Structures are given as C-alpha cells and as structure tokens.
C-alpha cells in the first residue's frame, strides 16, 4: 500500500496544481487587476479636476 | 466677446445667475438707445419762423439761445465703484487661482509618471506620490461642497 499511496497522490497533485493557480487568478491576480482599473479611474477624476 | 462664454464664466453656485442677467440687459438696452436716436445735434429753421411769428424778434432770439449750450444729466468719473473692485476681485479669485492651479498640476504630473513606474526601487518614492494623489481627490470635492 505504500507504493500505491505515492503514486495515486502524485497524480492528484498534479490536478491540484492546476486548480490552485487557476483559483487564485480572482483573488492574487484579480488583486493586479482591480488595482490597475482604480488607478486609471483615479487618473482620469485627478485630470478631470486640474482641468 | 463672450453669450456663449460669458454665461458660463461662473463657478458651480447659482448665486451669478441674478447678477450675470441685469448685466447683460443693460447692455443690450444702452446700445439700442444710441441707435434709435438721431447721432445729429438740432436742425432749428430758422430760416422759415423769423418770418412766419407774430411778435418781432421771437424767432430769432430763441434760435441763438437753443444753438449755443445748455444742460444734460451727464456724470464724471469720479465715482468709480466697479473700477476699484476689479482690481480687488483679481488678487483674491484670479491671484488665487495661479497657486491652486500650479500645485494642482505639478500633483498630477507626479502623480502619473510614479504610477507607470519599479517595486523596491522606485516603489517607495511611488508612495509618497499616492498620498498626496489622495488626499488631492478628497481637497478638490471640499472645494466643490
């Protein structure tokens, strides 16, 4: 059963790999994401009100 | 010369509407009134009354007295109320306005090039220049409200 427990967990590891990178697009690089949309709504209200 | 500029010279307030509107028809009224007017001084026929009247010497008398002076409700100068407050209105709202003008555009252009630039070198510089970009957005709708 020991070789068995390492091979069947490293297949699942593989799947899992994909699905955490995935999952984290909208919290770590939806963080990019929504930072750089606030940032140019900003830009444009800071040119708005300097014009 | 400006209906297109001149009723949008005002700030946000309301206030201008009343005083922008009684300057604008005062000047529309003073220029139609030299217009519809006669740009001549008298005619005075005399030509044709000294010898029409009655009594002698009435005509000719009346004619002389009429073409030399007399008086009108004319004014000076002197009291220059508007020429005094326009000097005064631009060192407190266009004196004023140069300075908020010049520090609201040197925020701005330091503002954009440190958000375009990286994250341990130019980061910490980047930051100082964030907090003052914030504390502009939250300055410019005091002067609005």
């Known amino acids: 059963i020991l070789l068995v427990t390492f091979l069947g967990f490293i297949a699942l590891i593989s799947k899992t790999v994909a699905p955490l990178y995935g999952e984290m697009a909208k919290n770590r690089t939806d963080h990019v994401v929504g930072l750089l949309n606030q940032a140019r709504a ?10 | 010369l400006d209906w297109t500029k001149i009723v949008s ?37 005399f030509a044709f009354y ?12 009346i004619q002389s007295d009429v073409s030399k002076f007399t008086p009108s409700k004319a004014n000076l100068s002197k009291q220059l109320n508007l020429i005094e407050s326009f000097e005064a209105k631009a060192l407190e709202n266009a004196k004023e306005t140069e300075s908020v003008v010049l520090a609201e555009l040197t925020d701005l252009e330091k503002t954009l090039e440190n958000i375009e630039s990286x994250x341990x070198x130019x980061x910490x510089x980047x930051x100082x220049x964030x907090x003052x970009x914030x504390x502009x957005x939250x300055x410019x709708x005091x002067x609005x409200x």
């Open chain 1, 42 to 51: 900003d830009h444009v209200n800071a040119v708005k009100t300097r014009i």
């Open chain 2, 9 to 45: 010279k005002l700030g946000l307030s309301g206030q201008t509407a009343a005083a922008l509107t009684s300057f604008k028809k005062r000047n529309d009224e003073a220029k139609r009134i030299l217009f519809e007017l006669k740009q001549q001084p008298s005619n005075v026929d």
């Open chain 2, 50 to 61: 000294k010898s029409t009247l009655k009594n002698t010497a009435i005509v000719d008398k």
